[PDB]
Amino acid sequence: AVTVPVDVVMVIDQSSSMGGQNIARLKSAIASGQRFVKKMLPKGMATEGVRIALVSYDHEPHRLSDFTKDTAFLCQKIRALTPIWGTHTQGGLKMARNIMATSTAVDKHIILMSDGLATEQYPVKNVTTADFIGETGNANDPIDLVIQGAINFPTNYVSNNPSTPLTPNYPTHSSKVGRRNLPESKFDYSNLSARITFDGVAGALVYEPRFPHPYYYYFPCNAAINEAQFAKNSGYTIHTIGYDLGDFALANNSLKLTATDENHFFTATPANLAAAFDNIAQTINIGIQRGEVTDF
Ligand SMILES: [Ca+2]
Ligand SMILES: [Ca+2]
């Protein structure tokens, strides 16, 4: 029985939302993460053809392991996941692209798991108003949803810092938000811990105070979809778990679009997360089968 080599990068959001009152989220993430590792590396170091790498992220990404068959090392890093402020989903994906760049596996998969909106992203170089876009007219688009939400709850969505007298302009239906189809050349990747801020803070929308009416906002959910697209263009399959998103359309739809397609997007709760990782492992393992060697 022949299988092609496969390399998997796990990218796990460890934002503050995973802990505190919500600690069931972290605990199930840790249980299911280890379950997935064991399922994919059943022989440990002797598992032919399979390797797993691990990224966690909060306001910055963390390389927890390069590609490895070392079940114990991976499981120890998963058990050490820690809720920390910030959701730099673009950064997690960017570090996954860095790691996958060295792969010569035939099959190349990224698993992204996040329980919230992205609120951090990398700076845009030589930024102009053309790097932003307005309402699409598709009410399910992350663009239209974030604009509508920020109209309903301006200080929840838009970067603002009450400890200073500085103040953003808040959006209307005419406002423009970060695109999700910028070229890779547009992002400053010189520092994977960097984030765009206004008045010292980030957010679901980050005000670009240099630009005029109708007002312009970086949109980290769109930046994350943009980064996912670079990975898919490189040939990597993305499976995304929208984790405990509680029927919040912006969070659901923003994460759905990072996946290879809608069939690679899973809506999970802590209670049923293991079933999503089981299905992803099954899909990966079905995909690598190349039959038997029976030349004669
Ligand atoms: Ca979160
Ligand atoms: Ca302020």
Residue numbers in the entry: 138 to 433
Original paper wording:
P. gingivalis expresses two antigenically distinct but structurally homologous type-V fimbriae that are important both for attachment to other bacteria and for invasion of different host tissues.
However, no phase information could be obtained so a shorter construct, Mfa5138–435, encompassing only the predicted vWF domain was crystallized. One single rectangular crystal diffracting to 1.85 Å in space group P21 and with one molecule in the asymmetric unit was obtained. A highly redundant dataset was collected, and the structure was solved using sulfur SAD. The structure was refined to final Rwork and Rfree of 13 and 18%. The structure obtained from Mfa5138–435, that will be referred to as Mfa5D1, is folded into a vWF domain consisting of a typical Rossman fold comprising a six-stranded β-sheet surrounded by three helices on each side. This globular domain, which has a wrench-like form, has the dimensions 44 Å × 52 Å × 79 Å and includes the MIDAS motif, which is a central feature for interaction with various targets. In the Mfa5 MIDAS site, the five residues coordinating the metal ion are situated on the wrench head on top of the β-sheet. Mfa5 has a classical MIDAS motif36 in which the side chain oxygens of Ser152, Ser154, and Thr224 coordinate the metal directly and the side chains of Asp150 and Asp252 coordinate the metal via a water molecule. One of the loops in the ARM2 domain coordinates the second metal in the structure. Based on the coordination distances (average 2.4 Å), this metal has been modeled as a calcium ion.
